[PDB]
Amino acid sequence: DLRLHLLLNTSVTCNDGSPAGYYLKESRGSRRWLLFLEGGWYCFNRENCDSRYDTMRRLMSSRDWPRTRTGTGILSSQPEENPYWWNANMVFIPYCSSDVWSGASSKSEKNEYAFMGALIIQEVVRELLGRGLSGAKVLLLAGSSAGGTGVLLNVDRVAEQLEKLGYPAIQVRGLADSGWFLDNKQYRHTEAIRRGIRYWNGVVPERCRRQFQEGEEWNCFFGYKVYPTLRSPVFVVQWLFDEAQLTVDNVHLVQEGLRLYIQNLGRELRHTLKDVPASFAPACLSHEIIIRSHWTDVQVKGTSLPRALHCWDRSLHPLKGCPVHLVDSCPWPHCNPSCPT
Numbered sequence: 001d002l003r004l005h006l007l008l009n010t011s012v013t014c015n016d017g018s019p020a021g022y023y024l025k026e027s028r029g030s031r032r033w034l035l036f037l038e039g040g041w042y043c044f045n046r047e048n049c050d051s052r053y054d055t056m057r058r059l060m061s062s063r064d065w066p067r068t069r070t071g072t073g074i075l076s077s078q079p080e081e082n083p084y085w086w087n088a089n090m091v092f093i094p095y096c097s098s099d100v101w102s103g104a105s106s107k108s109e110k111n112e113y114a115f116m117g118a119l120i121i122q123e124v125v126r127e128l129l130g131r132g133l134s135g136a137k138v139l140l141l142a143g144s145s146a147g148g149t150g151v152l153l154n155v156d157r158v159a160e161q162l163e164k165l166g167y168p169a170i171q172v173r174g175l176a177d178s179g180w181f182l183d184n185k186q187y188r189h190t191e192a193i194r195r196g197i198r199y200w201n202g203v204v205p206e207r208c209r210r211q212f213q214e215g216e217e218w219n220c221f222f223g224y225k226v227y228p229t230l231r232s233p234v235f236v237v238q239w240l241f242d243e244a245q246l247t248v249d250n251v252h253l254v255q256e257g258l259r260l261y262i263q264n265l266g267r268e269l270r271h272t273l274k275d276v277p278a279s280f281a282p283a284c285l286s287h288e289i290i291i292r293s294h295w296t297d298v299q300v301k302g303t304s305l306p307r308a309l310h311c312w313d314r315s316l317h318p319l320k321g322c323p324v325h326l327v328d329s330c331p332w333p334h335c336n337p338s339c340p341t
């Protein structure tokens, strides 16, 4: 079990002004630290945030959080469940800012809600340095869905923060799960991101911001555009037929037009990953994420995700029998027999 700690700086808050926090399980025989960002869509104006506050309140508030959580999948401490990093120090950071981990805006006389995702990550890191993170060799910033996009937006800021605080020996890396989206044409008929950034005072990585310039920061929420601007090593996990991508595209899984649309989407996703040397992209229709207990089952070309992640660790010390670039080439959901059932 991971134990809850509410932030000691109580001005770094969830949407409703309650303190943000993190769940921690220490492993004193390890210098590896895994910090996982929870996902769960976002809200982008007063009216849709009010609706989320009525029926998704744990994603906007710490008032009802439980004292403990069980680590699962990549956050499990059992070797059978987690062949990759079972002995690491484990951190789960709840998503209570509704801003894709991008916000830097406090509640005030003009703001009904606080959007502080980018500042929550910074404050968690700062408070962990006093609890053993100061001695780490590797900090892996991981996350799923909105948390996976959050990794892409924040990994280089964590690296810069640790450099400026005087910890240049900690190697910062990212693991983005299910957060690599395409700004494609819908099957039936990006503005939500543009509106959100303004409402949240959202921030994006500086090298990407300098390319797209003022007003066009929404581009940096798209992995294929932001990834080439990043300096930290990043491993990308993405289903070729991701269910959230299909939802945004107004597809609900077939006649000829939809067959062509689905095949073209898988081809486009594969194309965006061609020059991503550390990646795992199975040809499956899924919303399943890396904290699920059976995450070990899926394989690409005979290699599982825990194995590919281990090979990535070795590569940061190509390797014989230890691949890190694993992208399916077959063109239809479940053409890989190991897809989640």
Ligand SMILES: Cc1ccc(C)c(OC(=O)c2ccncc2)c1
Residues within 6 Å of the ligand: 040, 041, 042, 100, 145, 146, 149, 181, 182, 183, 184, 190, 192, 193, 221, 244, 245, 248
């Ligand atoms: C679940 C989730 C979390 C965060 C983001 C940014 C998501 O993607 C989009 O909002 C988006 C995708 C493609 N075209 C336009 C918009 C989806």
Ligand SMILES: *[C@@H]1O[C@H](CO)[C@@H](O)[C@H](O)[C@H]1NC(C)=O
Residues within 6 Å of the ligand: 009, 011, 012, 119
């Ligand atoms: C608490 O966090 C805010 C926002 O990052 C910061 O401005 C403030 O200085 C912090 N307080 C302390 C005591 O560090």
